[PDB]
Nucleic acid binder design. Structure first.
Ligand SMILES: [Mg+2]
Ligand SMILES: [Mg+2]
Ligand SMILES: [Mg+2]
Ligand SMILES: [Mg+2]
Ligand SMILES: [Mg+2]
Ligand SMILES: [Mg+2]
Ligand SMILES: [Mg+2]
Ligand SMILES: [Mg+2]
Ligand SMILES: [Mg+2]
Ligand SMILES: [Mg+2]
Ligand SMILES: [Mg+2]
Ligand SMILES: [Mg+2]
Ligand SMILES: [Mg+2]
Ligand SMILES: [Mg+2]
Ligand SMILES: [Mg+2]
Ligand SMILES: [Mg+2]
Ligand SMILES: [Mg+2]
Ligand SMILES: [Mg+2]
Ligand SMILES: [Mg+2]
Ligand SMILES: [Mg+2]
Lengths: 169, 183, 90, 172
RNA sequence: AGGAUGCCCCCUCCCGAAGGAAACCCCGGUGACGGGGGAGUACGAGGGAGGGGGUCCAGGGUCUGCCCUUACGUCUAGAAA
RNA sequence: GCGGGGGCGGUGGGGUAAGCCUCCGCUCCGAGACGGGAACAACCGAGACCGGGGUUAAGGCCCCCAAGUGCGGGCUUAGUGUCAAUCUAAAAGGGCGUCCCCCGCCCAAGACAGCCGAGGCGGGGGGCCCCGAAGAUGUACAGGGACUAAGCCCGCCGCCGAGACCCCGGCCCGCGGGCCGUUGGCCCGCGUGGGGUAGGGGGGCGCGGCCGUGGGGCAGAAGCCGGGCCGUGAGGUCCGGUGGACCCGCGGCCGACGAAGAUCCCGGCGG
C-alpha cells in the first residue's frame, strides 16, 4: 500500500458509481456507530465533541478504520460503552485507483509505462471539505478530558489536520 | 593634541585626508560610509585608526563561529597560493576587506578607492606626534548601547582566532605605552 | 540615555519648527510628550511631540502637569529664560 | 430628458498583454494609448463599458473648471493643432469655461462634434466642431500609488470619485 | 581631395516647447513632508546677434577611464551553447 | 504553413508525480527592441523611425547602484530573516520561549506557595521565533558586503527609475487633392501613421555585352595601396602614390549578373 500522501489531494472527479466500476473494493469498515446508539439512551448524554477537518482532502478507508479503533478502544476502557455514543460520520464512497504493472489484472495492465494508464481499483477513501465533521461523540460533561484524549488519539491516525470542537446538544 | 569632531557628510573635504576614529562604531555601518566617501571623492584619502575597537552586534559565540568557519572551511583544491582565497584575521585587515566588499568589483574605480584607504590598530605614533590631530566620528555609524544587547569588538574576535598574533601586539602596546603616553 | 521631564526645555530637531525652543508640559505615553513654546514667544504650537524629535537643553522650570501657556509664561519669568526661548538653533 | 453624469476616464495600463475583451472595450472607448483621456456621458450603456475596463482605467466625475483647463492645455483639433480661444469664438463660444460649463451642466450632450455633423451658419453648434474626441495627457507629476491595485485598496484603478480632477491637475 | 566665412572659452543680448526650482513669509502634521506667496518666476531643447582671446577644426591610429554588451551560418518551440 | 511553445484559468480528463500525456480560452514567445527580476524566449512594466529635453511604469532608495542609514507603533535573539514567480523548500507533531486576546473558577482581603495580606488557578486562540530540520569541490548561500535592522507585522511621507507618455527638430509611409507633355516628377492636406520571421507587394545600386547619345585618355586609361567628400543604404565621386592603353556619364535593351559559409572546388600561405 502506497503512502497516504499519494492519495491525499483531491485531483479529479469522484469515482463512486459501482455499476460502472469493475472490481470496486468492498468497504472493510465493520461498524460506524459505537457505544449506545439508541435514542432513548442518548438522552442521558449532554455534551457533543466533534473532530472537524481543517483542510479538504481524501482520507483512506484504512486510515478511517485505524482512527476508529484507537478512539473507540480508549472510550471503551476509560468511559464504558454505556456512557458514550461514538459515530464515524463519513463513509468512503470514493474508489481509489492505481496504475501499476501487476498480475492478471486485465489484458491492458501488461503494457508498461503511461500507455493505457487508467488505473485499477486500489482502495476507498472519503472526500472531505473544510469544517466537515469526521467523528461525532455524544457524552456527559464529566468525561470531557477522556473524550478529548480519545479524539486526539484518532487525529494522530488521520492524514489531514483536525481540531476538536466541544458543544452541548 | 587630539580634537574630536563630527564628520559632515555634506561638508566632506575633497582634497587632503580625513582621519576617522573607529572606536564605538559598527563595522558594517562605518564601512558603508567609508566606501561612499572614497567613491564620491576620487582625490581624497581616508585613514581609520582604532580599527580593533570596531563593533559587531550579536552573540560572541555566533560571531566567533562565523569567523572560524571563514578562516577554516573556506579553501581551494587547486594551487592555494595561485587560486584560493586568502582570508584576513587582523582587525585592520578585516575592516579593509569589508570596504573592498562594498566597493565596485574588477574595476579601476574599485581598485583606486581601496588604495586610498589606510586602516590602523590603535593610533600610530607618527599620527599622535602631529601638531593637531583632527579625528572624526560618524554618529549614524555609531552603536547605540542598550541594556542586554550583544556585541563584540574586532579585537576580541582577533584574540579568538589568532591568540599568539594578538599577544605580541598586546605586549607591544605595553612595551611602548610609556613612550606613547608622553605624546 | 535621554531624559525628558515635565518642565524641561527642549529644542525641536524635525518639522517646520526645528531649531526652536519649547517646554514640556505633559507626558502622553513613553513615546510622546506635550510641548509648548509658548507660541507668542517661540512659535511652537501646543501639540504632542515624539520623543525622538526633541533634544533636551540644560535648562528647566518647575510647573504642574499639563501647565497652561500663561502658566508656562510665568515660570519663564521665574528663571528669566524669555530671551533664551526666543533663540533659534543653527 | 435625463442629464446623466459626465465622467473622465483615463487609461492607466498599457497595450502589450491586456486581455482581449478588455482591449476591445478600451478601443471602443477611444482609449487606444496609455494615458489617453476621454470625457463621456454616464449613460447605462456607457457605464457597463467602463465596468468592463475597470481594472485598466481610473475614472470619476469631472468638474467644469478642470475640463476648462483640460480643453485649453491639451485640446486639439484636426491636424493636431492646439485649441485656441479664437477658434471657440469663431463658432459661438466666448470662453473655455462657458463651453465646459454647458457640457458638464447638461446644456449640450457632447463635447466634440460627431463625424457627420454639418456646420451651420449663425447658429452655434452644440459641440466644438472638429475637436478630437480624446486628450493626450502628460504622465502624472509626483507619480501614482499603484498601477496594479484598485483605488479602494490604496492603488489607482477603478472609480475614483471627484479625486479624478486632482489627478488631471497632476497630469496636465 | 573637407572647413579654416572654421572650432573652442568667456562675456553680453534676445526669443524660447514640454517642463520647472530656491531662500524667505504664512497654514497644517509627532514626522518624514503637504499647501498659499515667492512664481509659470530664476531656469529650460533649440533658435538669432554681437565682443574679446586662442589656434588649427573635421577626420584617422593606438591606449586609458566610465556606461552598454552571451562569435558566425543552420535545424529547431527553443543556440553563446 | 499543415512539428509549436510560456503564463494563467476549467479540482479540465489521466497519472504517485513529472520541465509528464491529451482537450478548452485570453495573452505573450516563435516573428518583439527596451526597464525590473542577480543571469534567464514568453513573470511584472512596456510595445522601439533618428537626435535631444522632460515626466512617469514596474521596481527600488545603507554600499556595490540612481534615489531615504525616511516617519510613527509593535514583534524577533533565531544572523531566524533579509520587498512575488522561474529560483534552491519544508510537514505532521512538541514549546506560556516570548508578546497578546478571550472564557471558567477562588480571593469580598479567611485567594495560590509555604500565620502571611495580594491577587491566584485552569482552559481556548492568535503573532513571531526554537526543536522536528542530514550530502556530497569553496565561507551564517540564494546576488555579494553586511545588517539586531539594513528582519518581520500595521500604517505613512518624499524621491529615483524605460525607447513607455509629453515636447522640439529631422526622416519616411498610407491615403486624398493639385500641378507639370507624363513608362515619370513635384507640392499640399489628413492619419490614438512608424516592431517584425516565412511569405506577398513597390522602388533602387552594382557587374558583362548590345542599340543610341555625349565625352575623356601618353600633358597618363584600366587595375592596385592609402585618404577626403556625398548617399539611410546597395554605392558614387574626388585626392596622393603606382601603373602603362584603354575607358566613362545619360536613355533603352539583354544576360554564362552580386558570396562568409555547402566535412564546398582550385591555388597559395600560416600557428
Ligand atoms: Mg485533475
Ligand atoms: Mg592554519
Ligand atoms: Mg603571492
Ligand atoms: Mg503584463
Ligand atoms: Mg579645402
Ligand atoms: Mg536540431
Ligand atoms: Mg528538439
Ligand atoms: Mg545560432
Ligand atoms: Mg501537428
Ligand atoms: Mg497552451
Ligand atoms: Mg520555427
Ligand atoms: Mg533583468
Ligand atoms: Mg547612490
Ligand atoms: Mg538564514
Ligand atoms: Mg506537504
Ligand atoms: Mg514595419
Ligand atoms: Mg547605361
Ligand atoms: Mg548564406
Ligand atoms: Mg585546400
Ligand atoms: Mg608550417
Amino acid at each position: 500500500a502506497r503512502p497516504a500522501r499519494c492519495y491525499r489531494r483531491i485531483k479529479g472527479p469522484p469515482y463512486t458509481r459501482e455499476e460502472y466500476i469493475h472490481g470496486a473494493p468492498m468497504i472493510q469498515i465493520p461498524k460506524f456507530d459505537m457505544g449506545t446508539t439508541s435514542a432513548a439512551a442518548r438522552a442521558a448524554f449532554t455534551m457533543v465533541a466533534k473532530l472537524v477537518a481543517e483542510e479538504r482532502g481524501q482520507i483512506r478507508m484504512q486510515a478511517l478504520e485505524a482512527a476508529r479503533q484507537i478512539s473507540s478502544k480508549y472510550l471503551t476502557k476509560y468511559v464504558g460503552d454505556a456512557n458514550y455514543y461514538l459515530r464515524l460520520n463519513v463513509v468512503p464512497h470514493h474508489v481509489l485507483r492505481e496504475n501499476r504493472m501487476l498480475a492478471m489484472a486485465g489484458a491492458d495492465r501488461l503494457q508498461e509505462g503511461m500507455r493505457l494508464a487508467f488505473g485499477s481499483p486500489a482502495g476507498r477513501a472519503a472526500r472531505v471539505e473544510p469544517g466537515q465533521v469526521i467523528f461525532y461523540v455524544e457524552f456527559k460533561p464529566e468525561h470531557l478530558a477522556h473524550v478529548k484524549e480519545a479524539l486526539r488519539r484518532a487525529a494522530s491516525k488521520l492524514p489531514i489536520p483536525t481540531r476538536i470542537v466541544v458543544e452541548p446538544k | 593634541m587630539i580634537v574630536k569632531k563630527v564628520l559632515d557628510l555634506s561638508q566632506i573635504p575633497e582634497k587632503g585626508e580625513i582621519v576617522i576614529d573607529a572606536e564605538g562604531h559598527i563595522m558594517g555601518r562605518l564601512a558603508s560610509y567609508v566606501a561612499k566617501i572614497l567613491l564620491s571623492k576620487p582625490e581624497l584619502r581616508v585613514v581609520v585608526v582604532n580599527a580593533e575597537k570596531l563593533v559587531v552586534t550579536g552573540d560572541r559565540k555566533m560571531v566567533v563561529e562565523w569567523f572560524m568557519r571563514k578562516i577554516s572551511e573556506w579553501r581551494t583544491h587547486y594551487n592555494p597560493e595561485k587560486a584560493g582565497p586568502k582570508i584576513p584575521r587582523r582587525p585592520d585587515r578585516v575592516f579593509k576587506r569589508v570596504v573592498r566588499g562594498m566597493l565596485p568589483k574588477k574595476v579601476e574605480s574599485g581598485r583606486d578607492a581601496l588604495k586610498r584607504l589606510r586602516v590602523y590598530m590603535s593610533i600610530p605614533l607618527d599620527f599622535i606626534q602631529r601638531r593637531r590631530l583632527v579625528l572624526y566620528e560618524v554618529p549614524a555609524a555609531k552603536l547605540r548601547v542598550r541594556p542586554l544587547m550583544q556585541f563584540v569588538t574586532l579585537e576580541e574576535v582577533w584574540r579568538s582566532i589568532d591568540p599568539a598574533a594578538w599577544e605580541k601586539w598586546n605586549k607591544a602596546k605595553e612595551v611602548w605605552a610609556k613612550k606613547i603616553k608622553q605624546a | 540615555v535621554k531624559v525628558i521631564d515635565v518642565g524641561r526645555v527642549v529644542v525641536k530637531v524635525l518639522g517646520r519648527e526645528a531649531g526652536r525652543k519649547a517646554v514640556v508640559v505633559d507626558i502622553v505615553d513613553e513615546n510622546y510628550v506635550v510641548i509648548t513654546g509658548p507660541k507668542s514667544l517661540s512659535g511652537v504650537r501646543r501639540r504632542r511631540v515624539n520623543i525622538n524629535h526633541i533634544e533636551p537643553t540644560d535648562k528647566k522650570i518647575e510647573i504642574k502637569k499639563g501647565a497652561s501657556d500663561e502658566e508656562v509664561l510665568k515660570a519663564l519669568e521665574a528663571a528669566g529664560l524669555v530671551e533664551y526661548m526666543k533663540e533659534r538653533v543653527k | 430628458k435625463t442629464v446623466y453624469p459626465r465622467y473622465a476616464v483615463i487609461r492607466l495600463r498599457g497595450i502589450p498583454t491586456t486581455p482581449g475583451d478588455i482591449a476591445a472595450t478600451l478601443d471602443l472607448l477611444r482609449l487606444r494609448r496609455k494615458f489617453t483621456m476621454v470625457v463621456v456621458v454616464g449613460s447605462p450603456s456607457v457605464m457597463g463599458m467602463i465596468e468592463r475596463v475597470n481594472d485598466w482605467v481610473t475614472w470619476g466625475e469631472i468638474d467644469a473648471d478642470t475640463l476648462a483647463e483640460v480643453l485649453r492645455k491639451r485640446g486639439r483639433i484636426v491636424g493636431d493643432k492646439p485649441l485656441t480661444l479664437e477658434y471657440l469664438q469663431k463658432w459661438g463660444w466666448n470662453s473655455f469655461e462657458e463651453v465646459a460649463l454647458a457640457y458638464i451642466s447638461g446644456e449640450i450632450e457632447t463635447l466634440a462634434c460627431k463625424k457627420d455633423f454639418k456646420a451651420r451658419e449663425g447658429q452655434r453648434p452644440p459641440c466644438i466642431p472638429y475637436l478630437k474626441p480624446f486628450f493626450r495627457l502628460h504622465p502624472p507629476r509626483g507619480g501614482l500609488n499603484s498601477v496594479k491595485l484598485h483605488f479602494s485598496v490604496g492603488g489607482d484603478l477603478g472609480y475614483r470619485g471627484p479625486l479624478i480632477n486632482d489627478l488631471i491637475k497632476r497630469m496636465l
